[PDB]
Design an enzyme around this catalytic site. Sequence first.
Site, PDB file in Angstrom:
ATOM      1  N   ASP A 145       8.122 180.497 -73.820  1.00 27.53           N
ATOM      2  CA  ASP A 145       7.689 179.354 -74.603  1.00 27.53           C
ATOM      3  C   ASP A 145       6.290 178.886 -74.181  1.00 27.53           C
ATOM      4  O   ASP A 145       5.503 178.555 -75.060  1.00 27.53           O
ATOM      5  CB  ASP A 145       8.706 178.209 -74.502  1.00 27.53           C
ATOM      6  CG  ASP A 145       8.283 176.954 -75.216  1.00 27.53           C
ATOM      7  OD1 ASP A 145       8.503 176.869 -76.453  1.00 27.53           O
ATOM      8  OD2 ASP A 145       7.719 176.068 -74.555  1.00 27.53           O
ATOM      9  N   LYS A 150      14.633 169.562 -62.987  1.00 29.37           N
ATOM     10  CA  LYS A 150      15.603 168.516 -62.642  1.00 29.37           C
ATOM     11  C   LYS A 150      16.965 169.121 -62.263  1.00 29.37           C
ATOM     12  O   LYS A 150      17.780 168.448 -61.630  1.00 29.37           O
ATOM     13  CB  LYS A 150      15.775 167.522 -63.809  1.00 29.37           C
ATOM     14  CG  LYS A 150      14.503 166.775 -64.223  1.00 29.37           C
ATOM     15  CD  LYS A 150      14.698 165.956 -65.513  1.00 29.37           C
ATOM     16  CE  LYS A 150      14.707 166.768 -66.801  1.00 29.37           C
ATOM     17  NZ  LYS A 150      13.373 167.339 -67.119  1.00 29.37           N
ATOM     18  N   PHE A 181      13.900 181.693 -68.417  1.00 26.81           N
ATOM     19  CA  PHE A 181      13.513 182.783 -69.310  1.00 26.81           C
ATOM     20  C   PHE A 181      12.816 182.223 -70.566  1.00 26.81           C
ATOM     21  O   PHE A 181      11.711 182.653 -70.881  1.00 26.81           O
ATOM     22  CB  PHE A 181      14.771 183.622 -69.680  1.00 26.81           C
ATOM     23  CG  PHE A 181      14.865 184.284 -71.035  1.00 26.81           C
ATOM     24  CD1 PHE A 181      13.957 185.268 -71.413  1.00 26.81           C
ATOM     25  CD2 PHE A 181      15.945 184.032 -71.874  1.00 26.81           C
ATOM     26  CE1 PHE A 181      14.099 185.948 -72.630  1.00 26.81           C
ATOM     27  CE2 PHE A 181      16.080 184.704 -73.089  1.00 26.81           C
ATOM     28  CZ  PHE A 181      15.146 185.642 -73.473  1.00 26.81           C
ATOM     29  N   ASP A 184      10.750 176.873 -85.126  1.00 27.21           N
ATOM     30  CA  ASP A 184       9.724 176.078 -84.453  1.00 27.21           C
ATOM     31  C   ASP A 184       8.326 176.691 -84.705  1.00 27.21           C
ATOM     32  O   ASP A 184       7.401 175.983 -85.105  1.00 27.21           O
ATOM     33  CB  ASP A 184      10.044 175.991 -82.937  1.00 27.21           C
ATOM     34  CG  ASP A 184       9.009 175.251 -82.113  1.00 27.21           C
ATOM     35  OD1 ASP A 184       7.998 175.874 -81.735  1.00 27.21           O
ATOM     36  OD2 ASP A 184       9.234 174.066 -81.808  1.00 27.21           O
ATOM     37  N   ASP A 213       3.260 178.597 -76.845  1.00 27.97           N
ATOM     38  CA  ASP A 213       2.748 177.241 -77.076  1.00 27.97           C
ATOM     39  C   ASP A 213       1.376 177.009 -76.447  1.00 27.97           C
ATOM     40  O   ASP A 213       0.818 175.911 -76.599  1.00 27.97           O
ATOM     41  CB  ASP A 213       3.756 176.194 -76.577  1.00 27.97           C
ATOM     42  CG  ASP A 213       5.053 176.210 -77.373  1.00 27.97           C
ATOM     43  OD1 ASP A 213       5.091 176.863 -78.425  1.00 27.97           O
ATOM     44  OD2 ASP A 213       6.018 175.549 -76.949  1.00 27.97           O
ATOM     45  N   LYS A 248      16.973 175.477 -81.315  1.00 21.51           N
ATOM     46  CA  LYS A 248      16.088 175.746 -80.164  1.00 21.51           C
ATOM     47  C   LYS A 248      16.483 175.026 -78.866  1.00 21.51           C
ATOM     48  O   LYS A 248      16.150 175.523 -77.797  1.00 21.51           O
ATOM     49  CB  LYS A 248      14.602 175.464 -80.477  1.00 21.51           C
ATOM     50  CG  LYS A 248      14.154 174.000 -80.439  1.00 21.51           C
ATOM     51  CD  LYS A 248      12.633 173.916 -80.263  1.00 21.51           C
ATOM     52  CE  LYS A 248      12.146 172.477 -80.259  1.00 21.51           C
ATOM     53  NZ  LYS A 248      10.662 172.392 -80.142  1.00 21.51           N
ATOM     54  N   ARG A 262       3.484 173.517 -66.025  1.00 20.15           N
ATOM     55  CA  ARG A 262       4.942 173.436 -66.095  1.00 20.15           C
ATOM     56  C   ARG A 262       5.475 173.103 -64.703  1.00 20.15           C
ATOM     57  O   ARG A 262       5.069 173.730 -63.722  1.00 20.15           O
ATOM     58  CB  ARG A 262       5.526 174.766 -66.639  1.00 20.15           C
ATOM     59  CG  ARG A 262       7.047 174.994 -66.443  1.00 20.15           C
ATOM     60  CD  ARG A 262       7.938 174.301 -67.466  1.00 20.15           C
ATOM     61  NE  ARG A 262       7.644 174.704 -68.850  1.00 20.15           N
ATOM     62  CZ  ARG A 262       8.076 174.047 -69.922  1.00 20.15           C
ATOM     63  NH1 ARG A 262       8.871 172.995 -69.786  1.00 20.15           N
ATOM     64  NH2 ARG A 262       7.742 174.455 -71.138  1.00 20.15           N
ATOM     65  N   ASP A 287      11.845 164.661 -75.517  1.00 18.45           N
ATOM     66  CA  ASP A 287      10.868 165.672 -75.102  1.00 18.45           C
ATOM     67  C   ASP A 287       9.600 165.598 -75.974  1.00 18.45           C
ATOM     68  O   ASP A 287       8.494 165.626 -75.429  1.00 18.45           O
ATOM     69  CB  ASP A 287      11.474 167.084 -75.135  1.00 18.45           C
ATOM     70  CG  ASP A 287      10.511 168.135 -74.635  1.00 18.45           C
ATOM     71  OD1 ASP A 287      10.187 168.114 -73.429  1.00 18.45           O
ATOM     72  OD2 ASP A 287      10.002 168.908 -75.467  1.00 18.45           O
ATOM     73  N   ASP A 288       9.764 165.427 -77.304  1.00 17.07           N
ATOM     74  CA  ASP A 288       8.636 165.283 -78.241  1.00 17.07           C
ATOM     75  C   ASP A 288       7.853 163.998 -77.989  1.00 17.07           C
ATOM     76  O   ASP A 288       6.627 164.013 -78.057  1.00 17.07           O
ATOM     77  CB  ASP A 288       9.115 165.326 -79.696  1.00 17.07           C
ATOM     78  CG  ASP A 288       9.714 166.650 -80.116  1.00 17.07           C
ATOM     79  OD1 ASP A 288       9.640 167.623 -79.324  1.00 17.07           O
ATOM     80  OD2 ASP A 288      10.263 166.717 -81.222  1.00 17.07           O
ATOM     81  N   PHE A 292      17.748 164.564 -76.791  1.00 19.48           N
ATOM     82  CA  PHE A 292      16.981 165.111 -75.681  1.00 19.48           C
ATOM     83  C   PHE A 292      15.669 165.745 -76.156  1.00 19.48           C
ATOM     84  O   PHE A 292      14.654 165.589 -75.480  1.00 19.48           O
ATOM     85  CB  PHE A 292      17.814 166.135 -74.905  1.00 19.48           C
ATOM     86  CG  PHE A 292      17.189 166.555 -73.598  1.00 19.48           C
ATOM     87  CD1 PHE A 292      17.303 165.759 -72.465  1.00 19.48           C
ATOM     88  CD2 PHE A 292      16.464 167.737 -73.504  1.00 19.48           C
ATOM     89  CE1 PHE A 292      16.705 166.138 -71.259  1.00 19.48           C
ATOM     90  CE2 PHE A 292      15.863 168.113 -72.298  1.00 19.48           C
ATOM     91  CZ  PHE A 292      15.991 167.312 -71.184  1.00 19.48           C
TER      92      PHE A 292
HETATM   93  O1  LIG Z   1       9.076 172.091 -72.268  1.00 14.26           O
HETATM   94  P1  LIG Z   1       8.565 172.084 -73.677  1.00 14.26           P
HETATM   95  O2  LIG Z   1       7.403 173.112 -73.726  1.00 14.26           O
HETATM   96  O3  LIG Z   1       8.048 170.662 -74.055  1.00 14.26           O
HETATM   97  C1  LIG Z   1       9.881 172.575 -74.849  1.00 14.26           C
HETATM   98  O4  LIG Z   1      10.823 171.572 -74.845  1.00 14.26           O
HETATM   99  C2  LIG Z   1      10.489 173.851 -74.359  1.00 14.26           C
HETATM  100  C3  LIG Z   1      11.577 174.565 -75.101  1.00 14.26           C
HETATM  101  C4  LIG Z   1      11.541 175.967 -75.116  1.00 14.26           C
HETATM  102  C5  LIG Z   1      12.537 176.652 -75.822  1.00 14.26           C
HETATM  103  C6  LIG Z   1      13.533 175.928 -76.458  1.00 14.26           C
HETATM  104  N1  LIG Z   1      13.549 174.578 -76.400  1.00 14.26           N
HETATM  105  C7  LIG Z   1      12.619 173.877 -75.744  1.00 14.26           C
HETATM  106  P2  LIG Z   1       9.215 172.749 -76.549  1.00 14.26           P
HETATM  107  O5  LIG Z   1      10.301 173.038 -77.542  1.00 14.26           O
HETATM  108  O6  LIG Z   1       8.127 173.865 -76.634  1.00 14.26           O
HETATM  109  O7  LIG Z   1       8.613 171.379 -77.004  1.00 14.26           O
HETATM  110  C1  LIG Z   2      15.099 172.389 -73.773  1.00 11.40           C
HETATM  111  C2  LIG Z   2      14.062 171.402 -73.333  1.00 11.40           C
HETATM  112  C3  LIG Z   2      13.721 170.268 -74.253  1.00 11.40           C
HETATM  113  C4  LIG Z   2      12.950 171.943 -72.452  1.00 11.40           C
HETATM  114  C5  LIG Z   2      12.829 171.361 -71.070  1.00 11.40           C
HETATM  115  O1  LIG Z   2      14.050 171.051 -70.423  1.00 11.40           O
HETATM  116  P1  LIG Z   2      14.058 170.143 -69.131  1.00 11.40           P
HETATM  117  O2  LIG Z   2      13.420 168.804 -69.467  1.00 11.40           O
HETATM  118  O3  LIG Z   2      15.492 169.945 -68.700  1.00 11.40           O
HETATM  119  O4  LIG Z   2      13.188 170.869 -68.033  1.00 11.40           O
HETATM  120  P2  LIG Z   2      13.621 171.211 -66.558  1.00 11.40           P
HETATM  121  O5  LIG Z   2      14.353 170.067 -65.899  1.00 11.40           O
HETATM  122  O6  LIG Z   2      14.501 172.442 -66.549  1.00 11.40           O
HETATM  123  O7  LIG Z   2      12.339 171.494 -65.794  1.00 11.40           O
HETATM  124 MG   LIG Z   3       6.614 174.389 -75.242  1.00 14.66          MG
HETATM  125 MG   LIG Z   4       7.953 175.518 -77.862  1.00 16.79          MG
HETATM  126 MG   LIG Z   5       7.953 169.706 -75.811  1.00 15.47          MG
END
Ligand SMILES: O=P(O)(O)C(O)(Cc1cccnc1)P(=O)(O)O
Ligand SMILES: C=C(C)CCOP(=O)(O)OP(=O)(O)O
Ligand SMILES: [Mg+2]
Ligand SMILES: [Mg+2]
Ligand SMILES: [Mg+2]
Lengths: 340, 340
Positions: A90, A44, A85, A161, A94, A187, A99, A230-231, A226
Site C-alpha cells: 500500500d 499498535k 504485507f 480504492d 499510495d 479494503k 510509516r 484513518d481518513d 476505523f
Molecule cells: O495506513 P494508510 O496508508 O492510511 C491505509 O489505511 C492503509 C490500508 C492499506 C490496505 C488496506 N486498508 C488500509 P489507506 O487505505 O491507504 O488509507
Molecule cells: C487498515 C488500516 C486503516 C491501516 C492501518 O492500521 P493501523 O492503524 O491499525 O496501523 P498499525 O497499528 O498496524 O500500525
Molecule cells: Mg496508504
Molecule cells: Mg491505500
Molecule cells: Mg489512510
Amino acid sequence: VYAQEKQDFVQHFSQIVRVLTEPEIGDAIARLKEVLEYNAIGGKYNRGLTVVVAFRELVEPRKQDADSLQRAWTVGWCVELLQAFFLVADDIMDSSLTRRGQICWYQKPGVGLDAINDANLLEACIYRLLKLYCREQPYYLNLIELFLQSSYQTEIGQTLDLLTAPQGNVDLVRFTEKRYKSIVKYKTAFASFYLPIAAAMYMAGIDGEKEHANAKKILLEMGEFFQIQDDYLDLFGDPSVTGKIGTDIQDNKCSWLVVQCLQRATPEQYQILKENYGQKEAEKVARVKALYEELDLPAVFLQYEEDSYSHIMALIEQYAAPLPPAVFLGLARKIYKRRK
Amino acid sequence: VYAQEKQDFVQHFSQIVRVLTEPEIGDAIARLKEVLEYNAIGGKYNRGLTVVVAFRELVEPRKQDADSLQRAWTVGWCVELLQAFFLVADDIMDSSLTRRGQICWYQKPGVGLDAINDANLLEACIYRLLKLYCREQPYYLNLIELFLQSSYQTEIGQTLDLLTAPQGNVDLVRFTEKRYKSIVKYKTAFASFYLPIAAAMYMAGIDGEKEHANAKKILLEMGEFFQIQDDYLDLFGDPSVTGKIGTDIQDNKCSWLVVQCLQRATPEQYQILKENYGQKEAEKVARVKALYEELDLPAVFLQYEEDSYSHIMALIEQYAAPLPPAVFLGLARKIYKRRK
Ligand SMILES: O=P(O)(O)C(O)(Cc1cccnc1)P(=O)(O)O
Ligand SMILES: C=C(C)CCOP(=O)(O)OP(=O)(O)O
Ligand SMILES: [Mg+2]
Ligand SMILES: [Mg+2]
Ligand SMILES: [Mg+2]
Ligand SMILES: O=P(O)(O)C(O)(Cc1cccnc1)P(=O)(O)O
Ligand SMILES: C=C(C)CCOP(=O)(O)OP(=O)(O)O
Ligand SMILES: [Mg+2]
Ligand SMILES: [Mg+2]
Ligand SMILES: [Mg+2]
C-alpha cells in the site's frame, strides 16, 4: 494492564522471527529477518492483541494450556503479518513517505521496488506459522481459508480504492457515500476487524455460520468507523502520533473527508475542490484543507464518531450473544476517540 | 495432437474468467477480468497442460469422469495463475518492457504500480478456484499447501535473485555456479516443474513422500535446465519468438551466461566485464554481448543443453518408477531445444 498485555504479545516476536529464519539461501533468510524486523514492529498491535484477548475470553481457562496459548499469540502474529504485507504494498501504491515513525520500507535506499517481493514474503510467513503450529488442530483449514478469504477481500477493496483514485483524472462524481462504504468494507473492515475475532472464534471451536455472521455485523461496522478515523487522521492527525504523512488529497482518494465536503459544498466551493484535488502542488493541497476547515469537517467528524460509537454499541447489544460482550467492548474501547 | 491439447486447455479459459468474475464492487471485478485476460493468456501454457496431461496418464480412464477432468484443467489454470502472479511482479522488479508479445502490464499507461495489487489478485484467484472445485476432494489441503509452499519457495528464490543483482553495485565475486544453482532451484525449478506434476500426483491419490521426492529429483534438475535456457534466450533469443526483451546484463543479474563468462575470462576480459556489466548504457550492454560471443558462450550453451538432456534422461530412468516414464518424457520433449 492493557499495556502489560501489549508488552507480553511483543515479547513473543523474537520467537516468531527465530522459527521463521531457521547454504547460499541464508542471505535470503537474513533479508526475510530484516523485512520482518522493519515492517511487523512499530504499530499498535491491536489486531494481534485482539486474537490473544478474544481467545482467552472465549476458551475455558482449564483448556488454555501452554501450547494452546502459544498457538493463540502465533495466530495473533499471523494477523500482524497480513497487515504488514498489505501496508508494504500500500505504501508503494499510495507513494507514501513514512510509516510507524520511520521512512517507508520501499523508500529506503537499496530497497525500492524489491519491496514488492518482500511484501509477498510477509504474506508467505502467515501460512508457514499456521503449518508449524496449527497443522494438527481441527480448525487448521478454517484458519487457512479465513486468512486467504480476508486477503482476497482486502485486495478487491484495494482495487476499488485505486480505481476511484486515478492519477491525473478528476473523479469527484465517483466520491459518493455508497462508493465510500463499498471501498472501506472490503479494503479494511473484513481483515482488520472480522479476521482477528473470527480466528479466535475458530480456535475456540466456534465455527457456526450464524455466530460468525452476527460477529461480522458488529465488526464490519466497527471497521467502517476505523477507516473513517484513518481518513480524518490522514489530514488532521498529528504525524508524530500517527507515525505517517498523509497523501489522500494528492492521491485523489475517495476519502471520507472529500465525500463529506461534496455533500456540504456550494457550487463555488465545488469548483475550488475540482481545481485543487488529486494533485502534488502543496498550495493546492493547502487550499483543499482550508475548504474542509471552512465547512467545519473536523466538527462533522467529532459528531460522526459519537453517533457511530452509539450505533456500534447498539449492534453489540443486538448481536454479541452468546459471545461475552467484553470481546467486542474491548476492541471498541481501543479504537474510539483514537488519535493514532 | 500436442497443439490440439493446447487448444482444448485454452478453450477452458472463458469458463475460468466467468466463474471468477461472477454492487459498486462490480468495477473491481471488471478490473480483475481485464487483469486475467491480459496476464494469463499469451504464453506456451506448458505448466497448465502438464497438470492435464499428467492427470490423464496417472488416473485410470474409468475414473476420469466429467467433474474429475474439469478439476484437472482448473488446477492446470491455477498453475498458470501462479505463473501470471510472479511474472506481473517480476516485470516491475526487473524493469522489463515487453512480455508475451505485448507491453508489460505495469508499463501500460494508467496501470503503473497498481499492478502490485493486480498481481496479488491473480494469486488470490488460485485459492478461489481450489475452493470452488476441489473443496470436497480428499487432496484439497494437499493442493492448498503445495501452491502455498511453491509460492514461498519462488519468493525466497526471487529474494536471492534480487540480492545478487544490486543496482549500481559490481557483484562479479557473487556470480558463482553454487549461487546460480541455489537461485534457480528456488525461483524457478520448484513452481515451474515440481508444482504441476505434484498437483496431478495429489489429484491421482499419489501422496507418498518417497514418490514425491523421486519426482522432485527429476523435475528440479529439469527446472535448472529451463532457467539456464531462459538466461541464454534473454540475450541470444529472438524477441519476436520469446515475446520479451532481455534485461539481465542491465539488471546486473547472476545469469548462467555471466557465470560461464567468469569461468573462461582472461584478466583482460574480466576487466571488460567489470566495467560494462549491470549498467543501462546500450554500448556497455553491446560490449558484454561481444565478450560472450568472443568466448563462444552460444556454443558452450549448445553443449550444456546436450549434456543436461542426457542427465535428465538418466534421472528419468532412475527415478520415474512406478510412474509412467511418459509423464516426465512429455515435459522434457516440450522444453528441450526450445527457442521460446
Ligand atoms: O495506513 P494508510 O496508508 O492510511 C491505509 O489505511 C492503509 C490500508 C492499506 C490496505 C488496506 N486498508 C488500509 P489507506 O487505505 O491507504 O488509507
Ligand atoms: C487498515 C488500516 C486503516 C491501516 C492501518 O492500521 P493501523 O492503524 O491499525 O496501523 P498499525 O497499528 O498496524 O500500525
Ligand atoms: Mg496508504
Ligand atoms: Mg491505500
Ligand atoms: Mg489512510
Ligand atoms: O521471464 P523472465 O523475466 O526472463 C524470468 O524467467 C521470470 C521469472 C520470474 C519469477 C521466477 N522465475 C522466473 P527471470 O527470472 O526474471 O529471468
Ligand atoms: C519460470 C520461467 C523461467 C519464466 C517464464 O516461463 P515460461 O517460459 O514458461 O513463460 P510462459 O510460457 O508462461 O509465457
Ligand atoms: Mg524477469
Ligand atoms: Mg526476475
Ligand atoms: Mg529471464
